[PDB]
């Protein structure tokens, strides 16, 4: 549960989530 906010706040942490987030759906 402590890792959720970590990778959430950290940009360098977001591995597959970072690129996925940039993928804005229609």
Q: Are 18 and 11 in contact (CB under 8 A)?
A: yes
Provide the 3-class DSSP secondary structure of residue 22.
helix
CA distance 23 to 2: 26
At 2, list the tokens.
Answer: 């402590």
CA distance 16 to 26: 20
DSSP state of 15: S
Using alpha carbons only, give the angle 18, 16, 10 rounded to the nearest 5 degrees. Answer: 45
Burial 1-26 (b: 16+ CB within 10 A, else e): eeeeeeeeeeeeeeeeeeeeeeeeee
Q: Are 2 and 13 in contact (CB under 8 A)?
A: no
- For residue 22, what are the CA distances in angstroms to 2, 17, 26? 24, 9, 12
């Amino acid at each position: 549960v402590s890792v959720d906010p970590f990778y959430e706040m950290l940009a360098a942490r977001k591995k597959r989530i970072s690129v996925k987030k940039k993928q804005e759906q229609p």
